Design a protein around this ligand. Structure first.
Ligand SMILES: N[C@H](CC(=O)O)Cc1ccccc1F
Lengths: 300, 237
């Protein structure tokens, strides 16, 4: 079990760790988060009490280094940094633990939620969507735009998700204009899966990462990307059976986890109604259709 | 974006544009079968592709063999239309290719956009005008060439005959739309108006009779009266 210590908490802030969150008061004796499960990516995120504008945060994997948070009063945010001196880090963490200045990652033993949300998410793929190669962790915030959003403005601060565009030459073959636009299987299976992602695991990883950035940061381009990757599958007549079953599980846990009060902004009515009720896969997402109908029947 | 009454003179500027109407592409007669079920029999159709500035009409005749063994023909018809318009554009020299293609029905937008991905500078647009181009098949010489076709075929017409020698393209388009609206509202009466006088003939190389300027004003008035008459008969006014 790993630890992300904090140097201090000089400004009042709501701190998120994966799907959990807690409040820290200005100059409260808080020195970080302990007992973080090894084996998964994690995200630690922030919303300042005095400016809820800009949620921001860091994706990281404790197996890749010793990370800590330190407030920067010049740039006005909590920054993640890596400590290269292992002995120094262990001694700092040990002292903060002995003084019980850390919150414990509050995982219920029965609870597979975070695994189920991050099953296919890898740090190495995160770092290719979020380009900042000098760091082993990746910063995301509410305002970052995607490469596709910029085509329709700072490239260094962009989310490089795979561009999906149903009315593009990439999606539509010479002589199969009607077939590829009404049945996206070519675009899903040959262009995206075989061509770009290489396998469905990488595709689901980007999908899951897009959802998490939408949920935790309100990142609008991430929400667009999540819906596009769902629609591309649902709008393909030919999808491997194992992918549809896995998609159903992925979406189920995403819908289960979504804050009820954010449904209005995180869920696209058109995409979901199309996917569940009109698409080729309208009968292939049993678990997801049942939770959507019981939890968000208004949207449908 | 969409084309409406605010930007109406744009039709007659010097940017090449085409209207595309697909309403006569897939045409059927519905009839009873021996067993008392209902079935359709397709008849020949046409794509109506018109340059409103010049009157040039590219009438692509859609022969009933194109739907043989094909399902969801109404959905297919918009794609067939898209495919033919795209083929027509590619067949034209670059300096004759349209800058804009205006579809009379919004369901043509995606099929044509998909067909025209190779032409990103050609704008595909809907219109809020209710244009009476479905009545094209009420023009006898156009109906005749469609029904006689035994194979796919493109036929070229100037739908304005020689009117542009005497009137502007705005006025010629207004005349055309009034004639077509009348033929759409009461074909029998409209044709009666157009031919009641045997001394005014249709030249072999024309579609409409050789009316003088004064006679066109009379005809145009009679067509308005017809449209108003039918509007009353319809609504009891
Ligand atoms: N050949 C076209 C192939 C395609 O774009 O999917 C499909 C098609 C369009 C229109 C009429 C017939 C027909 F088969």
């Amino acid at each position: 079990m790993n630890t992300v210590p904090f140097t201090s908490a000089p400004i009042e802030v709501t701190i998120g760790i994966d799907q959990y969150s807690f409040n820290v008061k200005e100059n409260q004796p808080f020195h970080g988060i302990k007992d973080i499960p090894i084996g998964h990516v994690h995200v630690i995120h922030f919303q300042h009490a005095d400016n809820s504008s800009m949620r921001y945060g860091y994706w990281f994997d404790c197996r890749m280094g010793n990370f800590y948070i330190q407030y920067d009063p010049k740039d006005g945010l909590y920054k993640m940094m890596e400590e290269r001196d292992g002995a120094k880090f262990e001694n700092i963490v040990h002292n903060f633990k002995e003084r019980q200045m850390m919150v414990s990652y509050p995982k219920i033993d029965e609870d597979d939620t975070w695994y189920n949300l991050t099953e296919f998410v890898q740090m190495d793929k995160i770092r290719k969507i979020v380009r900042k190669d000098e760091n082993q962790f990746s910063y995301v915030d509410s305002s970052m735009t995607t490469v596709q959003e910029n085509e329709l403005s700072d490239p260094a601060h962009s989310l490089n998700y795979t561009v999906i565009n149903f009315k593009s030459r990439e999606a539509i073959r010479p002589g199969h204009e009607m077939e590829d636009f009404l049945d996206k299987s070519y675009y899903l299976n040959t262009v995206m899966l075989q061509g770009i992602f290489k396998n469905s695991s990488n595709y689901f990883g980007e999908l899951q990462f897009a959802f998490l950035n939408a949920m935790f940061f309100g990142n609008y381009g991430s929400s667009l990307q999540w819906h596009a990757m769902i629609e591309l599958i649902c709008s393909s007549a030919t999808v491997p059976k194992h992918m549809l079953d896995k998609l159903d599980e992925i979406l189920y846990y995403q819908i289960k986890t979504l804050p009820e009060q954010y449904s209005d902004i995180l869920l696209n009515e058109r995409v979901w109604n199309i996917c569940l009720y009109s698409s080729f896969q309208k009968n292939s997402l049993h678990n997801t259709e049942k939770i959507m109908e019981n939890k968000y029947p208004e949207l449908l | 974006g969409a084309m409406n009454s605010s930007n109406y003179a744009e039709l007659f500027n010097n940017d090449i544009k085409l209207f595309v109407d697909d309403t006569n592409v897939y045409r059927v007669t519905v009839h009873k079968t021996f067993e008392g079920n209902v079935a359709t029999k397709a008849i020949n159709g046409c794509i109506f592709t018109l340059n409103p500035k010049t009157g040039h009409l590219f009438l692509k005749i859609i022969h009933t063999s194109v739907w043989a063994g094909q399902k969801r023909l109404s959905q297919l018809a918009k794609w067939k239309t898209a495919e033919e318009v795209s083929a027509l554009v590619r067949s034209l020299p670059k300096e004759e290719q349209p800058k804009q293609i205006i579809v009379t029905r919004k369901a043509m937008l995606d099929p044509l956009e998909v067909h025209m991905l190779d032409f990103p500078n050609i704008a595909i647009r809907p219109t809020e005008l209710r244009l009476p181009f479905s009545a094209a098949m009420s023009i006898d010489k156009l109906s005749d060439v469609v029904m006689k076709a035994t194979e796919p075929q493109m036929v070229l017409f100037n739908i304005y005959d020689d009117w542009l020698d005497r009137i502007s393209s705005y006025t010629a388009f207004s005349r055309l739309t009034l004639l077509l609206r009348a033929l759409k509202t009461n074909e029998e009466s409209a044709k009666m108006i157009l031919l009641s006088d045997p001394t005014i003939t249709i030249k072999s190389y024309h579609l409409w009779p050789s009316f003088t300027d004064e006679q066109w004003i009379t005809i145009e008035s009679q067509m308005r009266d017809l449209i108003l008459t039918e509007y009353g008969r319809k609504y009891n006014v």
